[PDB]
Amino acid sequence: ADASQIVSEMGAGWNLGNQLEAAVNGTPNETAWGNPTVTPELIKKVKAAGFKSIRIPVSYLNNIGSAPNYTINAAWLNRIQQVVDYAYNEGLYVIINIHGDGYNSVQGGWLLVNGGNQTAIKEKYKKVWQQIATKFSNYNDRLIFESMNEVFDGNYGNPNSAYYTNLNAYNQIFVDTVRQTGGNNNARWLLVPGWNTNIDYTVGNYGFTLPTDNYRSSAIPSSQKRIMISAHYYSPWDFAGEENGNITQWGATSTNPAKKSTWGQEDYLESQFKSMYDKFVTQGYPVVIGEFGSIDKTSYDSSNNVYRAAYAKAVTAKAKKYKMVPVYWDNGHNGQHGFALFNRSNNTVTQQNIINAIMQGMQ
Ligand SMILES: [Ca+2]
Prior knowledge:
This protein is an alpha/beta fold.
């Protein structure tokens, strides 16, 4: 699939959140954050709801062995492959990444743009991607590798240019390392972010650079890309992610201005997504909005789900407008401040109206 066709085929995506990226005191464990062990039935339920792509956060952390081989625990790679297969064998697009490892705030986090030993970070990263790519080399273009997740130094202000250079270096190392492994890895789509998956800091003049891809398969036309660009979207945070009841409504259908943000509405969403279209999509790079969503505030405002639905529809529809892939953030938590649309304990739907809103947004 070329850049336009892949977006169409990917449809609406869903994150298998709070599973294989979950870690406590440095060891990944897919149950560590309270979700059950993943089973194929969950992925079948998500497919039945209409999602065509599954994003699978994966952490590695202390399952990476010592230098210089940095060997990944074999049982962990085998488990990741089993979970990938639950989605891949159902005909879905699948994205796998390196997730917790890039955070300063995660115990064992090491893929740090601000870290002092960039030589060791870069070599470890190379060796880790060599192994993950090798494990999945025979998978077709429905499997996408994502270089890393949300990578920054912890500061929400303007990016340090030297640190941005490290980020860009990681993306370049990832691309070239993956291509030089076997199988279909020289041809598959590879997803890369800019700083903290932030749209403004990725599209603006802050230091992001597009990787070269000179080791890719000769079969890819010179005029096409096999790189996609990642951003995440939870704006305005006071509505979407802040864990209190100050703001519980969003968009034009809000019924109370005291419960609605003063910024970040439909006009902002338009400007933001148009900026990704103008910078990247027009140049032949698909864009994946790899996470979006809003937390459950029905404990504060009994009308909140009206707005969670409205927000999800609006973000999905804006992605559709601008020919980019919207991927919903589902963390399995049903309850206060949760993001789940399904109860993973029984594979039931818990948020039919939000699912319907997403699917309406794909029309
Ligand atoms: Ca998060």
